[PDB]
Every structure is written in C-alpha cells, then in structure tokens.
Design a protein around this nucleic acid. Structure first.
Ligand SMILES: CN1/C(=C/c2sc3ccccc3[n+]2CCCS(=O)(=O)O)Oc2ccccc21
Lengths: 212, 224
RNA sequence: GGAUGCGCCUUGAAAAGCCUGCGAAACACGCAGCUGGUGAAUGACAGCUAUGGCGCAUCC
C-alpha cells in the first residue's frame, strides 16, 4: 500500500502568513495527488488536483507543487476563513490513501473571554440532577482554566468542558464548562461560582449566583 | 435543470457483528458513467478511503481494513451507489461520505462533489432521546447570553437551531461531550442585546433524529 | 435566441511490454488519414485533413 505522510501535523500562523504544507508518498505516484480542505464536521472541498492544478472556483492564494515524491500545498497569504484540516490524497494506485491531515489554526492577538454562569433549571431539578453551566465567550488563545467552587470549596472530577471551533471571522474560541451535581447536593449549598483564568485577564474573573 | 447532488442515507446506530447498508443517491449526472468513492472519518480522526467503483466497467476496489466485509455497488435505475457493510465492529464507527471522482479534463482524479456524510455508530447501547432545558439569561460586555442544554441522549448527532433558523448571529453550539453515564450532552448558546429580552422571543429548536425527538423550548428570564 | 470570426481538444510509438492524450474512462472497452521529425528500443513530437465536442470575441 502507498503511504502518504504530511508535515507538519498541526500549525498556527497569523493572517497574511505564507503557509506551506508538505506531503510525502512512500512510493511513486506520478503527480496523481489532490489537496482538500475540510472544516470540522463538513465534507472536504477539493483545492488542488494533479499535484499542481488549481480547482475551479478555489481562491488563487492556494497552489500546489511537485518535486519527486514530495508535494507541497501553499497558501500565499493566510485568511481567517482558512482555518481547517488539510489533506493530501494519492490516486495513482488502488487502494487510494489520504495523508493524516495537517490542522491549520489562525494565530491572532490575545482576547479575553466574557464569562456567564447559568444555574440549573427548576425543570431539570424535578429530575434529580442539577447542571451548572459556565460560558467563556470569544477568547484567544484556546488555553483557559475554569475552576468551580461550591460554598467556596474547589470542585474536582465533576465537570466537563467543550470548546467550539475557531470562528471564521475573528479567529476566537468559546468554551462551556458544565458542573454536574445531584439535586440533593445542589440543594445543600448556596454559592455556585466559576473562576476563569486566561492570558487576557489581569486577575481571575469569577461569576457566581446564590441558589434561591 | 438538475444540479449535481449526492444525498446519503442509512446511517444510525447498529449492534456489532451485524450488517448495515449506506446509500448515496446521485442527481444531475449518470452514476454508471462516473466513479464513486466511499471515504470515512472516525470522530476526531483523519479521512480514510474505503472503497470505489469505476465507470462503465463497474470494477470495485477496497481498502484492506474493509476488504471482504464491505461491498460497494451501483444501481443505474435508481442512480444510486451503495456501501453494504457486514460484520460491523466498533472500529467501523465513523461519519461516512460518498464522493464523485470528477471529470479528468476538469479536475483530474480529484473528488469534486461530496455527500453530506452520515454517522454510523456501532454499539451495543440503546437509543435515548434528549431532555432540553433552558439556560436563562441573568438579571445582572454590554450584552446578554442565553441558551439551552441538551442532556442525556444517544447516539450522536443532535441538531440545534434558534428561532427556526432566523437567529444565527452570535450562536455557539458546542461539541457534544460523552458523560460518565455513556450518554451525550451539549449546550447551545447565543448572545443577544439585553434591551431585547422583554421584546424578542428566543426559541431553541432541537432535533435528535435517531429517537424522533423534536423539541422547541422557549428561553425567558426568571421572575426572581 | 440568431449570424460570423478566432482559438483549443479530438494522442503519441512502432512486435511485445511499459508510460501517456481523448472518449464522463486509474481496470475493461474505443479512438480515421497526410507531410516532416524521432526510435537500432526510444513517448518526441511539429503542422494539418476529417469527424465529434468546448471556450472567447464581434455583429443583429
Ligand atoms: C522491432 N524492433 C526494432 C525496429 C526498429 S528500430 C529503428 C530505428 C530507427 C528506424 C527504424 C527502426 N525500426 C523498425 C521500423 C519499422 S516500424 O516499427 O516503424 O513499423 O528495434 C527494436 C529494438 C529492440 C527490439 C525490437 C526492435
């Protein structure tokens, strides 16, 4: 089987940067190589075919090049909507094989999150569980620390986080942290707080509410 | 006119060891004169080519990880390609895409059209619909945030829209998380102007197809 | 929508094999002719006729 290996596997570049992604075939493939762009959860979109031909409708900042068994996708000047995973593919011999993908992230300036806290609904409380949600909206970089406190005691092991894909216009992230408690435990305590630490904040930001 | 389209169907939850077939219904071209490929993507992982069928001859090709268990075929009368999967294993769980290899003259051997993709989950677990709870805006950056929590469903996916699709600005629908219960949950939030909380209505439309759950939950502030 | 005009593609290489262009065309199937060039085993072709397409420009 022919193997395709891209380098790097992930990269972060600023708007306007020249980005180059490389892909190496283990055996000869004679420029039967295509490049695709894939947004998260969406079908891939063809960018380059026959190693170096720009597909109809693809912006001119994308180009492809061949040198022996090494193939290069170039983005001449990176745009915020170019955040994606890029894949090479050989179609010289069956079975066809894709590269492992290179994830391209847009590096931007630091942006501090806006923090919101959400108590459980009475509707959910009827069910015996309470979910407390903390929202971190429109921040950069991705790294952030969310700490839950219940009556000033630090929580551990009872929260989970999810983070959106990078925004296509402002390159920021949003993050949710969900604290899961039994109704019993929720009703035993008063102050529910999420404390957020992030590069864009001079000191941690705490959002809280009092049950009832 | 007939625009080129690939519409996949047949995805869902299936027990291991069984059989499941995916369909790829083509519009706008004659499927037996084109090359059709199946490509899959396990959650969080890379694209994996799975199989293909050649124009005019109908010759079929398969990846080793799949050969002998899957069969790709085409039906001219239905203009539809198929991926028959047998002896399903957990490693087969993935979003499956069908794709058309384009016209040599215009795009070489690149895949120029793709289906929307459909999730096949190979699991022994059972189907559970979600509960939808409001995330109410608070009484206190100039704007307000609100949302809905979609908790305890299986398998993926769920779709969420706001105001039947009229509200898209400021919406963030987070990736689902797998809870320790083995069920999924996710939140969808949107930021809106505080001044409009009394006037504008905000409804979160949640659809979980594998359980025929359609919910519309209004989100208003608490009286307090 | 109608006229005209321009351009382009409609292979190349031959015993075999391999490579390659076109035909919706990776395997299987199909691809007429002329002049020159090339090949002592080498894709290396140039300009065209014919037949099928495709794009651009002018004009009513
Ligand atoms: C058959 N054969 C061969 C013939 C050759 S070499 C050559 C070189 C210059 C001019 C003519 C020419 N010719 C014949 C032309 C007839 S034609 O093919 O044009 O009809 O050379 C071979 C070398 C190895 C194995 C078989 C071989």
């Amino acid at each position: 089987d022919i193997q395709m290996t891209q380098s790097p596997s992930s990269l972060s570049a600023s708007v306007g940067d020249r980005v180059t992604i490389t892909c190496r075939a283990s055996q000869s493939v004679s420029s039967a190589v295509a490049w695709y762009q894939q947004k998260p959860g969406k079908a891939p979109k063809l960018l380059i075919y026959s190693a170096s031909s720009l597909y109809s409708g693809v912006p001119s900042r994308f180009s492809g090049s061949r040198s022996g068994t090494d193939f290069t996708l170039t983005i001449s000047s990176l745009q915020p909507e170019d955040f994606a995973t890029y894949y090479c593919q050989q179609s010289y011999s069956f079975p066809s094989t894709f590269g492992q993908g290179t994830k391209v992230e847009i590096k931007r300036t630091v942006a501090a999150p806006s923090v919101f806290i959400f108590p459980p609904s009475d509707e959910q409380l009827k069910s015996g569980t309470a979910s407390v949600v903390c929202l971190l909206n429109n921040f950069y970089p991705r790294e952030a620390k969310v700490q839950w406190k219940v009556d000033n005691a630090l929580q551990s092991g009872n929260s989970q986080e999810s983070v959106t894909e990078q925004d296509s216009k402002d390159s920021t992230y949003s993050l949710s942290s969900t604290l899961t408690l039994s109704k019993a435990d929720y009703e035993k305590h008063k102050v529910y707080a999420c404390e957020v630490t992030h590069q864009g904040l001079s000191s941690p930001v705490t959002k809280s509410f009092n049950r009832g | 006119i007939s625009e080129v389209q690939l519409v996949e169907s047949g995805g869902g939850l299936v027990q291991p060891g069984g059989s499941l077939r995916l369909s790829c219904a083509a519009s706008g071209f004659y499927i037996s004169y084109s090359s059709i490929h199946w490509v899959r993507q396990a959650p969080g992982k890379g694209l994996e080519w799975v199989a293909s069928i050649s124009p005019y001859s109908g010759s079929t090709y398969y990846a080793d990880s799949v050969k002998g268990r899957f069969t790709i075929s085409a039906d001219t009368s239905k203009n539809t390609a198929y991926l028959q999967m047998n002896s399903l294993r957990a490693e087969d769980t993935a979003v499956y895409y069908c794709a058309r290899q384009g016209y040599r003259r215009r795009s070489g051997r690149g895949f120029d059209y793709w289906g929307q993709g459909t999730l096949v989950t190979v699991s022994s677990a059972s189907t559970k619909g979600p509960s939808v709870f409001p995330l109410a805006p608070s009484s206190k950056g100039g704007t307000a945030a609100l949302g809905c929590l979609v908790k305890d469903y299986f398998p993926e996916p769920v779709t969420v829209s706001w105001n039947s699709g009229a509200l898209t600005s400021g919406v963030h629908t987070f990736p689902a998380v797998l809870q320790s219960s083995g069920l999924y949950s996710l939140s969808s939030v949107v930021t809106v102007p505080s001044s409009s909380l009394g006037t504008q209505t905000y409804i979160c439309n949640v659809n979980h197809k594998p359980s025929n759950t359609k919910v519309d939950k209004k989100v208003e502030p608490k009286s307090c």
